RNA sequence: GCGGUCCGGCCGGGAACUCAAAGGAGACUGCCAGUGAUAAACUGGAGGAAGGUGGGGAUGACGUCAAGUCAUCAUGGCCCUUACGACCAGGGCUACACACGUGCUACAAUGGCGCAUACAAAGAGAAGCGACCUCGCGAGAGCAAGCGGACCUCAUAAAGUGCGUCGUAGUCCGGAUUGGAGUCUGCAACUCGACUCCAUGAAGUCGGAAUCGCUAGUAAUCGUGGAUCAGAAUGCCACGGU
């Protein structure tokens, strides 16, 4: 950071509802710049089929977050060259910026067409913390310990 | 009952059963397989008796068959290496 | 809005109502607060159908670089020619147990098929596109006439939807080549070309080193097309996409 100054942007919150756990909106994997066509398919986690699940319409959105929380991880910045990770304590701007990146890919995993398949086995079975959402739970805690003593 | 030469059409119906063979695929299925009366929504094991024989005469007449496919089918690959074409004279270098 | 229908506004007829024609619109940090050497300038928020060169395109310094394609005619030069000039049959710009430099055949867990609904974005319109009915089981080869035009076509157009079979197979997941029949574009298939059927199926299960593509309509792959029209797009002055 010579002379770059860090400005986390912010345009605006999902429009048809939204939560304070989006520390970045913004448009990308996408056209930049242009908003008419960004929310589509977005919404389609909260539950596949009401019939098929007894759970709650919004209360699952908070459960697959509770068991995917990482202890101790290395930092981006990596100013030294090889293998030196300071030890820097997981900031909050981590945990909500990329966190939503390991919730759908823990919902993704068997091999299909439809996204839709997939949620019949990672959410109407699996949500009372099966051991199919705790992929980075335990993983992150077990490759530490090695290297703290870099600096 | 052994619909097919080569195997026997198990836990399948009538109209995928002639689907892997070389005789019959898409085009030929609907030609002598709709002629009568027949379900193809139920099974084999689900049907009558009486209309069994009188569909294997019609992938026999004037239809190759697995057994018959070396039998008549090619074979005139063999009985044409005399006379030289055109053809021939273009895919062999 | 308001009257008949074929329910595609096919025509009686009205405007501010999914678009328009010689001309004028128009959204540019415009206002406030905070911050900043009070200026310049930045991150949000009242209005509003369009907030941060709005977006896209035409648009492009020889200040670097003597190194870029002269298979546009020496193009005011300098030049060469009967055997470096010509009509041309035949010796011929010839990939043979086929190696990504201009043409996608392939990449073989991304495999194939009969089934009762309003919207039409493009393209074309005096030596040219062709209605409708009849008619086309593979490729080919055809029947048939309003109209010198707001009435046809190119254009039969890969994915989706979704009981199986097959089992991590040397093959039902596929269809290079070794070997065999025809039509058409035709002096012309001998050498050296393309549309459609075939059996034995040969190398293979996601990849060494080196090297390297990826950020203001980002992307993957078995797919089209008005243009030259001898062999009827995959390579894009385009158009349309889930």
């Not at chain 1, 986390?8 to 939204?18: A, C, S, T």
Request: charged share 30%; with cysteine; hydrophobic share 40%.
């Amino acid at each position: 950071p010579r002379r770059r100054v860090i400005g986390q942007r912010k345009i605006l919150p999902d429009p048809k509802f939204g939560s304070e756990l989006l520390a970045k909106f913004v448009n990308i994997l996408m056209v930049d710049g242009k908003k008419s066509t960004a929310e589509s398919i977005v919404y389609s986690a909260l539950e596949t089929l009401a019939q098929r699940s007894g759970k709650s319409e919004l209360e699952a959105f908070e459960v697959a977050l509770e068991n995917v929380r990482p202890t101790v991880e290395v930092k981006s910045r990596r100013v030294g060259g090889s293998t030196y990770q300071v030890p820097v304590e997981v900031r909050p701007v981590r945990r909500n910026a990329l966190a939503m990146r390991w919730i759908v890919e823990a919902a993704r995993k068997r091999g299909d067409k439809s996204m839709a398949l997939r949620l019949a086995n990672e959410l109407s079975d699996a949500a009372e913390n099966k051991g199919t959402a705790v992929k980075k739970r335990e993983d992150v805690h077990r490759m530490a310990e090695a290297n703290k003593a870099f600096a | 009952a052994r619909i097919a030469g080569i195997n026997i059409p198990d836990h399948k119906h009538a109209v995928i059963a002639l689907t892997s063979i070389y005789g019959v695929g898409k085009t030929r299925s609907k030609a002598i397989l709709a002629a009568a009366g027949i379900a193809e929504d139920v099974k084999i094991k689900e049907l009558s008796e009486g209309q069994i024989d009188t569909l294997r005469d019609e992938v026999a007449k004037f239809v190759v068959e697995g057994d018959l496919r070396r039998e008549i089918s090619m074979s005139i690959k063999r009985l044409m290496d005399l006379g030289c074409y055109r053809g021939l004279r273009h895919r062999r270098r």
